[PDB]
Every structure is written in structure tokens, then in C-alpha cells.
């Protein structure tokens, strides 16, 4: 009954009609700038998941836009980062303060979260998943995204 990410078939993005959606598993973990971070804290709210690392040039490039989306969602939801392959936590935290990123991140160096996200490719960073209010993916992006990529999906929800 939980989300399973099936073959993208050469494509860098996938969209899901309400009819074909399933909820993601439980996502909880050590925060990057907080004790814990948990999707359950945003029940019935829109949630944009983003796997990133400061070592990652596309992630740095798309960082401002994810901040934009986070702000655009406001009350209605949140961005939640999944910081992967940053084995030194302090530089990932430095990146978040330096760029005025105000949304939480799960600190997950080996990207174990990928397994709970229905087998989204751990090789692909950045990855952005837009969850609807039932925390079911409406869109998966296997590529850097712009703020309008996400907003367009956001609005459809």
C-alpha cells in the first residue's frame, strides 16, 4: 500500500494522477539544524522533499528556488531537505545558514531514506518529490528543478 517508484523509462520527471497515488512510508530522522525532523509533523500538509548535499553543484544552483517554494507554500506546507553524502555535518549546517535556508533537513549521509521513499534512485542528487496532503507523490523530479517546476505541481494540488 505504500509508494513504489517504478521505472522512469529514460525520463527525468514523473507525474502521478490522484488515482495512481500511494502514501510514502514513515520518514523521520536526525535533523541537520534540529534534534529530529519528521514528516508526521506536517500531516495533511503539502510536503516537498529534496535530496541534496553542499558538495553538489546542481543542489547549490537550485537552492534559492527551493527556498522560494518553501516560502510560497507558507502555512499550507513545507520543504524538507534530505541531506545525503555530507559525512561532515558541520559544513552542511554552514551551507544552510550561509544561504538563508530556513526549512528543515533530515541528516542522512547514506541516504537510507531512499528505501522508505519507494526505491527512488539513491544515485540521483538532487531529487525532488512533491507529496500531496496525503503524503503521496504527485511528482518526482530526477533532475535539478526551478521554483516554477514545483509551483506548477503545487497549484494542481
PDB file of C-alpha atoms in Angstrom:
ATOM      1  CA  UNK A   1       0.000   0.000   0.000  1.00  0.00           C
ATOM      2  CA  UNK A   2       2.961   2.390   0.232  1.00  0.00           C
ATOM      3  CA  UNK A   3       4.506   4.261  -2.713  1.00  0.00           C
ATOM      4  CA  UNK A   4       6.765   2.305  -5.051  1.00  0.00           C
ATOM      5  CA  UNK A   5       8.870   4.202  -7.565  1.00  0.00           C
ATOM      6  CA  UNK A   6       8.686   2.316 -10.842  1.00  0.00           C
ATOM      7  CA  UNK A   7      10.947   2.670 -13.870  1.00  0.00           C
ATOM      8  CA  UNK A   8      11.063   6.266 -15.138  1.00  0.00           C
ATOM      9  CA  UNK A   9      11.905   4.728 -18.529  1.00  0.00           C
ATOM     10  CA  UNK A  10      14.523   7.273 -19.629  1.00  0.00           C
ATOM     11  CA  UNK A  11      12.607  10.274 -18.304  1.00  0.00           C
ATOM     12  CA  UNK A  12      13.879  12.820 -15.766  1.00  0.00           C
ATOM     13  CA  UNK A  13      10.476  13.505 -14.242  1.00  0.00           C
ATOM     14  CA  UNK A  14       7.265  11.577 -13.479  1.00  0.00           C
ATOM     15  CA  UNK A  15       3.785  12.784 -12.540  1.00  0.00           C
ATOM     16  CA  UNK A  16       1.057  10.853 -10.701  1.00  0.00           C
ATOM     17  CA  UNK A  17      -2.686  11.259 -11.081  1.00  0.00           C
ATOM     18  CA  UNK A  18      -4.589  11.024  -7.814  1.00  0.00           C
ATOM     19  CA  UNK A  19      -5.885   7.634  -8.973  1.00  0.00           C
ATOM     20  CA  UNK A  20      -2.441   6.028  -9.024  1.00  0.00           C
ATOM     21  CA  UNK A  21      -1.028   7.570  -5.867  1.00  0.00           C
ATOM     22  CA  UNK A  22       0.063   5.797  -2.712  1.00  0.00           C
ATOM     23  CA  UNK A  23       1.458   7.269   0.524  1.00  0.00           C
ATOM     24  CA  UNK A  24       5.218   7.171   1.274  1.00  0.00           C
ATOM     25  CA  UNK A  25       6.489   5.221   4.285  1.00  0.00           C
ATOM     26  CA  UNK A  26       7.320   6.869   7.589  1.00  0.00           C
ATOM     27  CA  UNK A  27      10.049   9.465   7.258  1.00  0.00           C
ATOM     28  CA  UNK A  28      11.727  10.582  10.486  1.00  0.00           C
ATOM     29  CA  UNK A  29      15.369  11.270  11.399  1.00  0.00           C
ATOM     30  CA  UNK A  30      18.192  13.304  12.919  1.00  0.00           C
ATOM     31  CA  UNK A  31      17.833  16.916  11.829  1.00  0.00           C
ATOM     32  CA  UNK A  32      20.610  18.986  10.288  1.00  0.00           C
ATOM     33  CA  UNK A  33      19.792  22.043  12.375  1.00  0.00           C
ATOM     34  CA  UNK A  34      17.466  20.402  14.906  1.00  0.00           C
ATOM     35  CA  UNK A  35      17.220  17.306  17.106  1.00  0.00           C
ATOM     36  CA  UNK A  36      14.648  15.465  14.992  1.00  0.00           C
ATOM     37  CA  UNK A  37      12.770  16.028  11.727  1.00  0.00           C
ATOM     38  CA  UNK A  38       9.580  14.121  10.839  1.00  0.00           C
ATOM     39  CA  UNK A  39       7.035  14.153   8.000  1.00  0.00           C
ATOM     40  CA  UNK A  40       4.419  13.276  10.625  1.00  0.00           C
ATOM     41  CA  UNK A  41       4.796  16.857  11.871  1.00  0.00           C
ATOM     42  CA  UNK A  42       3.256  18.001   8.577  1.00  0.00           C
ATOM     43  CA  UNK A  43       0.242  15.662   8.397  1.00  0.00           C
ATOM     44  CA  UNK A  44      -2.429  16.959   5.993  1.00  0.00           C
ATOM     45  CA  UNK A  45       0.091  19.498   4.711  1.00  0.00           C
ATOM     46  CA  UNK A  46       1.868  19.629   1.352  1.00  0.00           C
ATOM     47  CA  UNK A  47       5.482  18.454   1.594  1.00  0.00           C
ATOM     48  CA  UNK A  48       8.305  18.967  -0.892  1.00  0.00           C
ATOM     49  CA  UNK A  49      11.182  16.511  -0.310  1.00  0.00           C
ATOM     50  CA  UNK A  50      14.588  17.365  -1.710  1.00  0.00           C
ATOM     51  CA  UNK A  51      17.731  15.254  -1.538  1.00  0.00           C
ATOM     52  CA  UNK A  52      20.787  17.492  -1.544  1.00  0.00           C
ATOM     53  CA  UNK A  53      24.372  17.950  -0.361  1.00  0.00           C
ATOM     54  CA  UNK A  54      26.543  21.083  -0.232  1.00  0.00           C
ATOM     55  CA  UNK A  55      29.135  19.156  -2.297  1.00  0.00           C
ATOM     56  CA  UNK A  56      26.624  19.085  -5.118  1.00  0.00           C
ATOM     57  CA  UNK A  57      26.772  21.860  -7.706  1.00  0.00           C
ATOM     58  CA  UNK A  58      23.206  21.483  -9.042  1.00  0.00           C
ATOM     59  CA  UNK A  59      21.941  21.468  -5.452  1.00  0.00           C
ATOM     60  CA  UNK A  60      23.721  24.806  -4.764  1.00  0.00           C
ATOM     61  CA  UNK A  61      22.329  26.133  -8.048  1.00  0.00           C
ATOM     62  CA  UNK A  62      18.689  25.200  -7.282  1.00  0.00           C
ATOM     63  CA  UNK A  63      18.931  26.147  -3.593  1.00  0.00           C
ATOM     64  CA  UNK A  64      17.415  29.625  -3.824  1.00  0.00           C
ATOM     65  CA  UNK A  65      14.437  28.260  -5.731  1.00  0.00           C
ATOM     66  CA  UNK A  66      13.656  25.639  -3.110  1.00  0.00           C
ATOM     67  CA  UNK A  67      13.751  28.473  -0.568  1.00  0.00           C
ATOM     68  CA  UNK A  68      11.282  30.299  -2.777  1.00  0.00           C
ATOM     69  CA  UNK A  69       8.888  27.330  -2.929  1.00  0.00           C
ATOM     70  CA  UNK A  70       9.156  26.884   0.839  1.00  0.00           C
ATOM     71  CA  UNK A  71       8.024  30.455   1.292  1.00  0.00           C
ATOM     72  CA  UNK A  72       5.326  30.103  -1.387  1.00  0.00           C
ATOM     73  CA  UNK A  73       3.816  27.146   0.483  1.00  0.00           C
ATOM     74  CA  UNK A  74       3.729  29.084   3.745  1.00  0.00           C
ATOM     75  CA  UNK A  75       1.041  27.723   6.073  1.00  0.00           C
ATOM     76  CA  UNK A  76      -0.119  25.118   3.585  1.00  0.00           C
ATOM     77  CA  UNK A  77       3.124  23.153   3.765  1.00  0.00           C
ATOM     78  CA  UNK A  78       6.903  22.979   3.831  1.00  0.00           C
ATOM     79  CA  UNK A  79      10.068  21.909   2.065  1.00  0.00           C
ATOM     80  CA  UNK A  80      12.013  19.149   3.829  1.00  0.00           C
ATOM     81  CA  UNK A  81      15.589  18.551   2.773  1.00  0.00           C
ATOM     82  CA  UNK A  82      17.273  15.195   2.833  1.00  0.00           C
ATOM     83  CA  UNK A  83      20.993  15.919   3.210  1.00  0.00           C
ATOM     84  CA  UNK A  84      22.916  12.984   1.744  1.00  0.00           C
ATOM     85  CA  UNK A  85      26.654  12.185   1.377  1.00  0.00           C
ATOM     86  CA  UNK A  86      27.618  15.059   3.627  1.00  0.00           C
ATOM     87  CA  UNK A  87      29.688  12.994   6.042  1.00  0.00           C
ATOM     88  CA  UNK A  88      30.877  16.108   7.778  1.00  0.00           C
ATOM     89  CA  UNK A  89      27.749  17.605   9.264  1.00  0.00           C
ATOM     90  CA  UNK A  90      29.268  20.988  10.091  1.00  0.00           C
ATOM     91  CA  UNK A  91      29.748  22.077   6.504  1.00  0.00           C
ATOM     92  CA  UNK A  92      26.177  21.105   5.584  1.00  0.00           C
ATOM     93  CA  UNK A  93      24.929  23.211   8.503  1.00  0.00           C
ATOM     94  CA  UNK A  94      27.217  26.054   7.404  1.00  0.00           C
ATOM     95  CA  UNK A  95      25.654  25.915   3.941  1.00  0.00           C
ATOM     96  CA  UNK A  96      22.168  26.304   5.420  1.00  0.00           C
ATOM     97  CA  UNK A  97      22.959  29.413   7.453  1.00  0.00           C
ATOM     98  CA  UNK A  98      25.107  30.921   4.721  1.00  0.00           C
ATOM     99  CA  UNK A  99      22.353  30.825   2.146  1.00  0.00           C
ATOM    100  CA  UNK A 100      19.472  31.705   4.408  1.00  0.00           C
ATOM    101  CA  UNK A 101      17.785  28.310   4.082  1.00  0.00           C
ATOM    102  CA  UNK A 102      15.026  28.291   6.683  1.00  0.00           C
ATOM    103  CA  UNK A 103      13.466  24.871   6.078  1.00  0.00           C
ATOM    104  CA  UNK A 104      14.472  21.708   7.974  1.00  0.00           C
ATOM    105  CA  UNK A 105      16.653  18.902   6.625  1.00  0.00           C
ATOM    106  CA  UNK A 106      16.973  15.301   7.668  1.00  0.00           C
ATOM    107  CA  UNK A 107      20.653  14.486   8.115  1.00  0.00           C
ATOM    108  CA  UNK A 108      21.027  11.220   6.233  1.00  0.00           C
ATOM    109  CA  UNK A 109      24.574  10.725   4.882  1.00  0.00           C
ATOM    110  CA  UNK A 110      23.982   7.306   3.308  1.00  0.00           C
ATOM    111  CA  UNK A 111      20.500   8.178   2.020  1.00  0.00           C
ATOM    112  CA  UNK A 112      18.739   5.366   3.860  1.00  0.00           C
ATOM    113  CA  UNK A 113      15.545   7.403   3.338  1.00  0.00           C
ATOM    114  CA  UNK A 114      15.570   6.344  -0.312  1.00  0.00           C
ATOM    115  CA  UNK A 115      14.335   2.937   0.851  1.00  0.00           C
ATOM    116  CA  UNK A 116      11.335   4.481   2.586  1.00  0.00           C
ATOM    117  CA  UNK A 117      10.574   6.614  -0.458  1.00  0.00           C
ATOM    118  CA  UNK A 118       9.716   3.589  -2.550  1.00  0.00           C
ATOM    119  CA  UNK A 119      13.120   2.948  -4.059  1.00  0.00           C
ATOM    120  CA  UNK A 120      13.820   6.347  -5.545  1.00  0.00           C
ATOM    121  CA  UNK A 121      17.357   6.085  -7.060  1.00  0.00           C
ATOM    122  CA  UNK A 122      19.972   6.900  -4.349  1.00  0.00           C
ATOM    123  CA  UNK A 123      22.345   7.704  -7.192  1.00  0.00           C
ATOM    124  CA  UNK A 124      20.360  10.790  -8.207  1.00  0.00           C
ATOM    125  CA  UNK A 125      21.095  14.044  -6.381  1.00  0.00           C
ATOM    126  CA  UNK A 126      19.356  16.322  -6.405  1.00  0.00           C
ATOM    127  CA  UNK A 127      15.936  14.611  -6.441  1.00  0.00           C
ATOM    128  CA  UNK A 128      12.730  16.436  -5.645  1.00  0.00           C
ATOM    129  CA  UNK A 129       9.492  14.760  -4.627  1.00  0.00           C
ATOM    130  CA  UNK A 130       6.270  16.734  -4.276  1.00  0.00           C
ATOM    131  CA  UNK A 131       3.911  14.978  -1.853  1.00  0.00           C
ATOM    132  CA  UNK A 132       0.196  15.877  -1.704  1.00  0.00           C
ATOM    133  CA  UNK A 133      -1.790  16.287   1.513  1.00  0.00           C
ATOM    134  CA  UNK A 134      -1.921  12.508   1.970  1.00  0.00           C
ATOM    135  CA  UNK A 135       1.849  12.496   1.553  1.00  0.00           C
ATOM    136  CA  UNK A 136       1.644  10.654  -1.757  1.00  0.00           C
ATOM    137  CA  UNK A 137       3.963  11.665  -4.512  1.00  0.00           C
ATOM    138  CA  UNK A 138       2.291  13.835  -7.151  1.00  0.00           C
ATOM    139  CA  UNK A 139       5.582  14.382  -8.947  1.00  0.00           C
ATOM    140  CA  UNK A 140       9.127  13.027  -8.852  1.00  0.00           C
ATOM    141  CA  UNK A 141      11.964  15.033 -10.401  1.00  0.00           C
ATOM    142  CA  UNK A 142      15.212  13.187 -11.167  1.00  0.00           C
ATOM    143  CA  UNK A 143      16.915  16.432 -12.029  1.00  0.00           C
ATOM    144  CA  UNK A 144      17.541  19.908 -10.742  1.00  0.00           C
ATOM    145  CA  UNK A 145      14.249  21.858 -10.600  1.00  0.00           C
ATOM    146  CA  UNK A 146      13.207  25.509 -10.827  1.00  0.00           C
ATOM    147  CA  UNK A 147      10.740  27.082  -8.436  1.00  0.00           C
ATOM    148  CA  UNK A 148       8.118  27.088 -11.214  1.00  0.00           C
ATOM    149  CA  UNK A 149       8.558  23.321 -11.815  1.00  0.00           C
ATOM    150  CA  UNK A 150       7.399  22.814  -8.259  1.00  0.00           C
ATOM    151  CA  UNK A 151       4.854  25.599  -8.055  1.00  0.00           C
ATOM    152  CA  UNK A 152       3.012  24.264 -11.108  1.00  0.00           C
ATOM    153  CA  UNK A 153       2.634  20.935  -9.368  1.00  0.00           C
ATOM    154  CA  UNK A 154       1.883  22.690  -6.082  1.00  0.00           C
ATOM    155  CA  UNK A 155      -1.018  24.606  -7.622  1.00  0.00           C
ATOM    156  CA  UNK A 156      -2.556  21.443  -9.116  1.00  0.00           C
ATOM    157  CA  UNK A 157      -2.894  20.035  -5.585  1.00  0.00           C
TER     158      UNK A 157
END
